[PDB]
Design an enzyme around this catalytic site. Structure first.
Site, PDB file in Angstrom:
ATOM      1  N   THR B  37       0.904  -1.449  -0.005  1.00 42.23           N
ATOM      2  CA  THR B  37      -0.210  -0.072   0.339  1.00 42.23           C
ATOM      3  C   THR B  37       0.930   1.695   0.222  1.00 42.23           C
ATOM      4  O   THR B  37       1.707   1.393   1.386  1.00 42.23           O
ATOM      5  CB  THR B  37      -1.203  -0.100   1.109  1.00 42.23           C
ATOM      6  OG1 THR B  37      -2.038  -1.291   1.272  1.00 42.23           O
ATOM      7  CG2 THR B  37      -2.022   1.640   1.707  1.00 42.23           C
ATOM      8  N   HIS B 191      -6.187 -12.080  -0.111  1.00 42.73           N
ATOM      9  CA  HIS B 191      -5.334 -11.216   1.484  1.00 42.73           C
ATOM     10  C   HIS B 191      -6.437 -11.608   2.335  1.00 42.73           C
ATOM     11  O   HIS B 191      -7.189 -10.814   2.897  1.00 42.73           O
ATOM     12  CB  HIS B 191      -5.548  -9.866   1.370  1.00 42.73           C
ATOM     13  CG  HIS B 191      -4.238  -9.046   2.342  1.00 42.73           C
ATOM     14  ND1 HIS B 191      -4.239  -9.640   3.249  1.00 42.73           N
ATOM     15  CD2 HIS B 191      -4.218  -8.025   2.443  1.00 42.73           C
ATOM     16  CE1 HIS B 191      -3.749  -8.716   4.155  1.00 42.73           C
ATOM     17  NE2 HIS B 191      -4.210  -7.645   3.357  1.00 42.73           N
ATOM     18  N   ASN B 194      -2.403  -9.523   8.106  1.00 45.75           N
ATOM     19  CA  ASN B 194      -2.776  -8.312   8.531  1.00 45.75           C
ATOM     20  C   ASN B 194      -3.772  -7.745   9.324  1.00 45.75           C
ATOM     21  O   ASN B 194      -4.019  -6.668   9.337  1.00 45.75           O
ATOM     22  CB  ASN B 194      -1.884  -7.600   7.105  1.00 45.75           C
ATOM     23  CG  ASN B 194      -0.958  -7.860   6.932  1.00 45.75           C
ATOM     24  OD1 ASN B 194       0.375  -9.151   7.435  1.00 45.75           O
ATOM     25  ND2 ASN B 194      -0.406  -8.175   5.337  1.00 45.75           N
ATOM     26  N   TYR B 196      -7.290  -7.762   8.699  1.00 44.21           N
ATOM     27  CA  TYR B 196      -7.950  -7.390   7.432  1.00 44.21           C
ATOM     28  C   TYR B 196      -9.475  -8.178   7.525  1.00 44.21           C
ATOM     29  O   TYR B 196      -9.254  -8.530   8.791  1.00 44.21           O
ATOM     30  CB  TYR B 196      -7.613  -6.683   6.094  1.00 44.21           C
ATOM     31  CG  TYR B 196      -6.968  -5.572   5.941  1.00 44.21           C
ATOM     32  CD1 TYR B 196      -6.866  -4.556   6.394  1.00 44.21           C
ATOM     33  CD2 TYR B 196      -5.297  -5.681   6.805  1.00 44.21           C
ATOM     34  CE1 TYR B 196      -6.263  -3.344   6.719  1.00 44.21           C
ATOM     35  CE2 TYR B 196      -4.317  -4.809   6.555  1.00 44.21           C
ATOM     36  CZ  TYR B 196      -4.177  -3.715   6.541  1.00 44.21           C
ATOM     37  OH  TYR B 196      -4.141  -2.198   7.511  1.00 44.21           O
ATOM     38  N   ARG B 243      -3.464 -14.807   0.807  1.00 43.97           N
ATOM     39  CA  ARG B 243      -1.653 -14.068   2.522  1.00 43.97           C
ATOM     40  C   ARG B 243      -2.219 -14.708   3.614  1.00 43.97           C
ATOM     41  O   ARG B 243      -3.548 -14.063   3.771  1.00 43.97           O
ATOM     42  CB  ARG B 243      -1.895 -13.128   1.922  1.00 43.97           C
ATOM     43  CG  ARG B 243      -0.609 -13.163   3.398  1.00 43.97           C
ATOM     44  CD  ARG B 243       0.103 -11.589   2.138  1.00 43.97           C
ATOM     45  NE  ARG B 243       1.309 -10.929   2.417  1.00 43.97           N
ATOM     46  CZ  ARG B 243       2.359 -10.066   2.862  1.00 43.97           C
ATOM     47  NH1 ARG B 243       1.692  -9.164   2.953  1.00 43.97           N
ATOM     48  NH2 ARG B 243       3.479 -10.059   2.860  1.00 43.97           N
ATOM     49  N   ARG B 348       9.253  -3.282   2.071  1.00 39.35           N
ATOM     50  CA  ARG B 348      10.401  -2.157   2.642  1.00 39.35           C
ATOM     51  C   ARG B 348      11.699  -1.912   1.202  1.00 39.35           C
ATOM     52  O   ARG B 348      11.385  -0.538   1.272  1.00 39.35           O
ATOM     53  CB  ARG B 348      10.548  -2.286   4.120  1.00 39.35           C
ATOM     54  CG  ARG B 348       9.272  -1.293   4.947  1.00 39.35           C
ATOM     55  CD  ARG B 348       9.209  -1.511   5.704  1.00 39.35           C
ATOM     56  NE  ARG B 348       9.394  -3.015   6.686  1.00 39.35           N
ATOM     57  CZ  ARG B 348       9.654  -3.314   8.016  1.00 39.35           C
ATOM     58  NH1 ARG B 348       9.606  -2.348   8.953  1.00 39.35           N
ATOM     59  NH2 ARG B 348      10.002  -4.634   8.840  1.00 39.35           N
ATOM     60  N   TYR B 375       3.355   6.931   2.856  1.00 40.28           N
ATOM     61  CA  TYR B 375       1.784   7.257   1.816  1.00 40.28           C
ATOM     62  C   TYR B 375       1.458   8.781   1.186  1.00 40.28           C
ATOM     63  O   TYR B 375      -0.054   8.736   1.469  1.00 40.28           O
ATOM     64  CB  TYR B 375       1.435   6.546   3.454  1.00 40.28           C
ATOM     65  CG  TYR B 375       1.855   5.500   4.010  1.00 40.28           C
ATOM     66  CD1 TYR B 375       1.190   4.316   3.355  1.00 40.28           C
ATOM     67  CD2 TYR B 375       2.071   5.613   5.456  1.00 40.28           C
ATOM     68  CE1 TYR B 375       0.974   2.976   3.924  1.00 40.28           C
ATOM     69  CE2 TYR B 375       2.150   3.931   5.524  1.00 40.28           C
ATOM     70  CZ  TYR B 375       1.369   3.321   4.934  1.00 40.28           C
ATOM     71  OH  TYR B 375       1.712   1.704   5.644  1.00 40.28           O
TER      72      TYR B 375
HETATM   73  C1  LIG Z   1       4.473   1.151   3.435  1.00 40.11           C
HETATM   74  C2  LIG Z   1       3.761  -0.668   3.740  1.00 40.11           C
HETATM   75  C3  LIG Z   1       2.257  -0.717   2.720  1.00 40.11           C
HETATM   76  C4  LIG Z   1       2.457  -2.565   3.059  1.00 40.11           C
HETATM   77  N1  LIG Z   1       0.967  -2.960   2.496  1.00 40.11           N
HETATM   78  C5  LIG Z   1       0.613  -3.783   2.416  1.00 40.11           C
HETATM   79  C6  LIG Z   1      -0.365  -4.305   1.370  1.00 40.11           C
HETATM   80  O1  LIG Z   1      -1.096  -3.415   0.612  1.00 40.11           O
HETATM   81  N2  LIG Z   1      -0.761  -5.725   1.449  1.00 40.11           N
HETATM   82  C7  LIG Z   1      -0.558  -6.720   2.406  1.00 40.11           C
HETATM   83  O2  LIG Z   1      -0.058  -8.087   2.193  1.00 40.11           O
HETATM   84  N3  LIG Z   1       0.813  -6.048   2.947  1.00 40.11           N
HETATM   85  C8  LIG Z   1       1.470  -4.968   3.044  1.00 40.11           C
HETATM   86  N4  LIG Z   1       2.239  -4.979   3.925  1.00 40.11           N
HETATM   87  C9  LIG Z   1       3.467  -5.958   4.244  1.00 40.11           C
HETATM   88  C10 LIG Z   1       4.023  -6.463   3.102  1.00 40.11           C
HETATM   89  O3  LIG Z   1       3.673  -7.026   2.176  1.00 40.11           O
HETATM   90  C11 LIG Z   1       5.184  -6.356   4.432  1.00 40.11           C
HETATM   91  O4  LIG Z   1       4.567  -7.939   4.570  1.00 40.11           O
HETATM   92  C12 LIG Z   1       5.859  -5.863   5.324  1.00 40.11           C
HETATM   93  O5  LIG Z   1       6.372  -5.185   5.117  1.00 40.11           O
HETATM   94  C13 LIG Z   1       7.363  -6.522   5.807  1.00 40.11           C
HETATM   95  O6  LIG Z   1       8.402  -7.309   4.210  1.00 40.11           O
HETATM   96  P1  LIG Z   1       9.352  -6.531   4.906  1.00 40.11           P
HETATM   97  O7  LIG Z   1      10.303  -6.681   6.648  1.00 40.11           O
HETATM   98  O8  LIG Z   1      10.402  -7.138   3.928  1.00 40.11           O
HETATM   99  O9  LIG Z   1       9.302  -4.894   4.352  1.00 40.11           O
HETATM  100  C14 LIG Z   1       2.991  -3.022   3.445  1.00 40.11           C
HETATM  101  C15 LIG Z   1       4.026  -2.794   4.081  1.00 40.11           C
HETATM  102  C16 LIG Z   1       4.445  -1.524   4.256  1.00 40.11           C
HETATM  103  C17 LIG Z   1       5.165  -1.621   5.014  1.00 40.11           C
HETATM  104  O1  LIG Z   2       0.172   0.421   4.610  1.00 40.37           O
HETATM  105  C1  LIG Z   2       0.031  -0.636   5.419  1.00 40.37           C
HETATM  106  C2  LIG Z   2      -0.308  -1.832   5.190  1.00 40.37           C
HETATM  107  C3  LIG Z   2      -0.041  -3.219   6.166  1.00 40.37           C
HETATM  108  C4  LIG Z   2      -0.181  -4.454   5.781  1.00 40.37           C
HETATM  109  C5  LIG Z   2      -1.046  -4.619   4.773  1.00 40.37           C
HETATM  110  O2  LIG Z   2      -1.618  -6.062   4.549  1.00 40.37           O
HETATM  111  C6  LIG Z   2      -1.605  -3.504   4.429  1.00 40.37           C
HETATM  112  C7  LIG Z   2      -1.416  -2.307   4.558  1.00 40.37           C
END
Ligand SMILES: Cc1cc2nc3c(=O)[nH]c(=O)nc-3n(C[C@H](O)[C@H](O)[C@H](O)COP(=O)(O)O)c2cc1C
Ligand SMILES: O=Cc1ccc(O)cc1
Ligand SMILES: Cc1cc2nc3c(=O)[nH]c(=O)nc-3n(C[C@H](O)[C@H](O)[C@H](O)COP(=O)(O)O)c2cc1C
Ligand SMILES: O=Cc1ccc(O)cc1
Lengths: 399, 399
Positions: B37, B191, B194, B196, B243, B348, B375
């Site tokens: 996101t 999804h 997280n 939701y 997921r 990230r 964001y």
């Molecule tokens: C800014 C941001 C937006 C995210 N949006 C989503 C999302 O739309 N759907 C989702 O399933 N996870 C989302 N995540 C979680 C990531 O897919 C991921 O599981 C998490 O950031 C950890 O992996 P990383 O340490 O490599 O960042 C988001 C994470 C961040 C930081």
């Molecule tokens: O914007 C953060 C975010 C984190 C996990 C999600 O699954 C969706 C959005």
């Protein structure tokens, strides 16, 4: 008269030889003797054997601070059906148990009575003689054609137990538990594995009940958790333990070919952890490894390789005993033992090696077991397996 | 404008750089862009912002044969409630998504639309303005007091959806899936993580229903499995994925301190394997690692060390995508990728590195992400992070 064919490795510098507290008991090392049925009990009172058993447990408890789990022991006559397995309900049974417990305690070792309830694995013709039922979760799910034939010949058909009969077994686990501890046992282990009665409720292959004891994970686990909670109420969590065989097929259980089997065990174990967080925790959970899906088959046969017991460490945060083909695989014992609070059990190799703990510690050769006398009513193959030094004097060599 | 402070290691000779078939797609490597996101969509109408987003996705799909999962994308208006997140139900949304998919395909990369239904995480004043409900599993279990007041202030109190309304959501997942595939997506991701809406049904902390949609493991999983079965029927299991986040606490979810967690996911994943074995195997299951319990916290903060996702491998025999703090730990990525059919997701660090795949392959320094612009309604922090060569020209150094 020879040694198992493998290269032994010393375990004395691994976590296997680190001390650990298990309930009340300060273990000096983590080599455990798991429950092993031997069929030397005396009939018709299911009396622990008066000439031979004290020596058998005395030998195998010789290394100070060893946990010993007894052979499966019936908590009531209705739980049984093998005449040469001991029970722990009667005064004359208890008298003999006390001598066994004393021998183990005199070695500075510990003893845990495994409470075993057979269900459909029982011999129904033997039960019939005593005016006892042939019990299971259901009337109609026989474990096989031979067992069905045996039951029908005996006019003792499989009986899906009622809710009241369920409460009665509960009372008998409690009774046997209090009796075991009174006679001097350190704890009791609830046998919920290897296709016996509680496992028959746990596994959908053997339980399609439509009351509260079947038809869902929670309902299949209900009997087992009532047993745990009643035994805990009576003797305390520190004196209680349980055994599961998630991947076992022995007894016509599902094993890992049913993908829903891990969830069943994840749930029951998660329930035990819930209970631990709320108060005193169960002393240990004992798991049979997929390394051995059936203990009648030789080592490395029907090793389920597509599933492991690793899931437990993400749920249960107390001691875990693991048992299955470790004697031949010191490398795997050592790896599993690096996981927190892990004990390693040795079954067939403890039958054959009275001084197993020492042999494991020093990386000495292990006597090979003699399958022929696992279950005979004989001193032979029970108390006449040699110590290491005696095996050397007799010129033992790899088979 | 710096690099992440860590020691990079080349991954080109590990399993992460081996090809693998995922659904219909021949991936060249196993580095995955998970759902992220960014809130660059146009309001009103939740319209993908192609003017900026085409480039963002073009950049991150530059390495041929990469699997990209989109930012969470609403399958219907009532699923939504964040005005700058895209939807995929309307003609005008679809017309933009077609362009974005095209760009990814021009790179010989692949794109999977994550279908995102918010439930109680939604902003209830934004739904109220559109005449939409604020939905969850129950009317009364709010994610927190701030959020509760927010709902009451907007006179949009939380609403536990009825079987009819659940069926309506299922209809919408189906609708959005066919639509997404029709516009050219390679697959969809349901999804269920997280905190939701689907995860709100899975977790007892947000679901104490006593109908078939809660009060047990099977019940709590029911909505998730209905969605899976509907979507699979509409688009095929090979264009379907899901997921989960067993150890997540984000969204006021239980995480690993609730010992029943693992069973819930073993049950759902076992049900998915049963489907697979009956000939309908999902393309992949995506798991968030306990490594990241809350993606709002810095890498290595709130790492749940008492539980792992390793249980999956005893149950599911399909591809597994694992995500969470892998950029900073190439040793763990390498180790996890030795497990069968395992893909490694980077969130990230993919935000921050358009050419992440190349940098992982070659062991190059990685740009550090800037949370400030995760964001923001800007190209800055979206499409202006530099390639490796560009970062060298700008004299980047470790943080
Ligand atoms: C800014 C941001 C937006 C995210 N949006 C989503 C999302 O739309 N759907 C989702 O399933 N996870 C989302 N995540 C979680 C990531 O897919 C991921 O599981 C998490 O950031 C950890 O992996 P990383 O340490 O490599 O960042 C988001 C994470 C961040 C930081
Ligand atoms: O914007 C953060 C975010 C984190 C996990 C999600 O699954 C969706 C959005
Ligand atoms: C002769 C014999 C008797 C056994 N009896 C019992 C028993 O009474 N209770 C039980 O839980 N398991 C029993 N088992 C299973 C063992 O405790 C163990 O799980 C199995 O033998 C695998 O370990 P091992 O490979 O080290 O022998 C028995 C196994 C054998 C070979
Ligand atoms: O007699 C063999 C035996 C095996 C496993 C058990 O649990 C009990 C007995």
């Amino acid at each position: 008269m020879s040694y198992m064919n493998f290269d032994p490795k010393p375990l004395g510098d691994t976590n296997i030889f680190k001390p650990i507290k298990i309930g009340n008991n300060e273990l000096k090392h983590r080599v455990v003797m798991p429950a092993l049925t031997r069929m030397r009990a005396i009939a018709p009172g299911n009396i622990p054997n008066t000439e031979w058993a004290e020596e058998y447990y005395r030998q195998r408890s010789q290394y100070p601070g060893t946990l010993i789990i007894t052979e499966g022991t019936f908590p009531s006559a209705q739980s049984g059906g093998y005449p040469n397995v001991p029970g722990i309900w009667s005064k004359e049974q208890l008298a003999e148990w006390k001598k066994i417990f004393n021998a183990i305690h005199e070695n500075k070792s510990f003893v845990w009575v495994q409470l075993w309830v057979l269900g459909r694995q029982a011999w129904p013709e033997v039960l019939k003689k005593e005016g006892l039922r042939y019990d299971s979760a259901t009337d109609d799910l026989y474990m096989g054609e031979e067992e069905k034939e045996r039951a029908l010949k005996a006019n003792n058909p499989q009986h899906g137990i009622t809710k009241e009969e369920i409460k009665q077994y509960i009372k008998e686990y409690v009774d046997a538990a209090k009796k075991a501890i009174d006679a001097g046992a350190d704890g009791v282990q609830i046998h919920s594995a290897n296709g016996y009665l509680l496992n028959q409720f746990l596994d959908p292959i053997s339980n399609n009940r439509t009351d509260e004891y079947g038809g869902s994970i929670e309902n299949r686990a209900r009997f087992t958790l009532e047993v745990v909670d009643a035994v805990v109420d009576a003797v305390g969590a520190e004196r209680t333990s349980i055994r599961f065989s998630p991947y076992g097929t022995f007894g016509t259980m599902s094993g890992g070919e049913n993908p829903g089997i891990v969830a069943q065990y994840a749930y029951v174990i998660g329930e035990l952890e819930k209970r631990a967080r709320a108060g005193k925790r169960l002393a240990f959970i004992d798991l049979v490894e997929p390394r051995v899906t059936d203990p009648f088959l030789p080592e490395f046969e029907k090793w389920f390789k597509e599933g492991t017991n690793e899931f437990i460490y993400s749920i249960w945060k107390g001691p875990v005993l693991r048992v299955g083909n470790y004697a031949l695989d010191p490398d795997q014992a050592t790896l599993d033992s690096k996981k927190p609070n892990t004990l390693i059990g040795y079954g067939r190799s403890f039958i054959a090696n009275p001084d197993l703990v020492y042999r494991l510690e020093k990386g000495l050769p292990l006597n090979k077991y003699d399958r022929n006398t696992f279950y005979t009513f004989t001193k032979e193959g029970y108390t006449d397996y040699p110590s290491y030094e005696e095996s050397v004097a007799k010129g033992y060599k790899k088979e």
